Amino acid sequence: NFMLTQPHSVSESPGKTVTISCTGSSGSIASNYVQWYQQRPGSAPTTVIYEDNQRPSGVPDRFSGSIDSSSNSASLTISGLKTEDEADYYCQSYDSSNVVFGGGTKLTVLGQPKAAPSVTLFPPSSEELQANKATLVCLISDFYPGAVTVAWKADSSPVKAGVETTTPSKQSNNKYAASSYLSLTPEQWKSHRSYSCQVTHEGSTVEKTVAPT
Amino acid sequence: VGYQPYRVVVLSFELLHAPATVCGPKKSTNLVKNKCVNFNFNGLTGTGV
Amino acid sequence: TPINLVRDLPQGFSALEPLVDLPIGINITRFQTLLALHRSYLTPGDSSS
Numbered sequence: 001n002f003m004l005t006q007p008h009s010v011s012e013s014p015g016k017t018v019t020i021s022c023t024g025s026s027g028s029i030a031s032n033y034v035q036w037y038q039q040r041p042g043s044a045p046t047t048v049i050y051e052d053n054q055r056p057s058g059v060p061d062r063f064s065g066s067i068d069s070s071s072n073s074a075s076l077t078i079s080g081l082k083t084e085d086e087a088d089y090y091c092q093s094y095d096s097s098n099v100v101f102g103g104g105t106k107l108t109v110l111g112q113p114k115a116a117p118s119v120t121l122f123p124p125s126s127e128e129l130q131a132n133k134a135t136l137v138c139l140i141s142d143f144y145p146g147a148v149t150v151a152w153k154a155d156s157s158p159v160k161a162g163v164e165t166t167t168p169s170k171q172s173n174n175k176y177a178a179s180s181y182l183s184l185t186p187e188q189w190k191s192h193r194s195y196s197c198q199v200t201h202e203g204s205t206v207e208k209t210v211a212p213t
Numbered sequence: 214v215g216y217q218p219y220r221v222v223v224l225s226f227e228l229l230h231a232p233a234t235v236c237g238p239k240k241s242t243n244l245v246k247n248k249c250v251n252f253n254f255n256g257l258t259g260t261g262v
Numbered sequence: 263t264p265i266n267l268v269r270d271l272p273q274g275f276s277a278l279e280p281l282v283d284l285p286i287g288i289n290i291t292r293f294q295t296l297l298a299l300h301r302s303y304l305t306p307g308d309s310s311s
């Protein structure tokens with residue numbers, strides 16, 4: 001029942017000093033070796049310090065660790081932060097026969113330009129109609145901020161059933177892009193005269209319309 | 214959670230040679246009459262009907 | 263107290279009852295009253311003469 005306690009969120013401006021703690025629950029922190037792994041997002045973890053004072057060959061000198069056995073806490077001190085330090089630090093105590101990893105500590109330090117919501121629409125294809133389905137796809141792209149509200153319309157009545165939308169995502173254009181899908185039956189697509197997608201972004205509204213042709 | 218804006222206020226009390234100005238009230242039970250009882254109406258410990 | 267007189271206040275008697283009691287507890291040594299003036303169409307409207 002030995003668990004390591006680590007703060008969830010730690011943020012500090014670059015160039016300053018910060019202390020990362022790791023508190024043991026039952027066993028004393030000086031009983032067993034405490035190791036810190038620096039893991040980049042979408043990458044394998046890498047050892048950043050071991051033996052509570054020993055640095056691996058390759059990491060810089062700033063990664064310093066200390067042990068406070070009176071408070072049952074392991075302290076990792078970082079001095080002079082910069083960009084690539086934005087990784088996850090897990091304090092590891094294998095103890096005996098079981099690695100107890102820490103919760104983890106991330107980093108948070110801080111140009112997206114404003115843009116117009118280009119909107120395109122497509123009607124359901126004939127192949128989809130032959131496969132007893134119909135889906136209207138609304139696409140919002142090349143815009144900023146990434147906070148848009150979609151509202152499907154059947155001629156004049158809003159449609160909310162079967163509406164699926166995507167959260168805005170980052171692209172190479174430094175702008176945002178999103179998507180919206182309206183699943184429909186083949187008879188519902190041809191029941192209304194026209195279907196339109198309305199996109200609201202920074203007050204301005206861009207609306208496209210399609211018709212069964 | 215450790216860096217969010219928190220609205221913190223402190224309520225302090227003062228003790229001087231002045232009567233109470235802002236203080237809590239007191240509850241109210243029943244009332245009796247025409248019997249020899251003791252009453253404390255803020256100025257006297259009077260016993261009587 | 264209603265009256266119909268402009269000068270030499272009458273010899274009648276009238277007590278004074280309280281309206282509010284303020285427990286402030288501060289010094290006081292000087293006082294001054296406030297008056298209100300009117301700005302009609304006859305006066306130019308400037309507070310000089």
Ligand SMILES: *[C@@H]1O[C@H](CO)[C@@H](O)[C@H](O)[C@H]1NC(C)=O
Nearest residue numbers: 229286287288289290291292
């Ligand atoms: C109040 O006034 C008296 C004299 O007018 C002065 O001696 C005393 O210090 C004053 N106290 C306070 C609290 O201002």
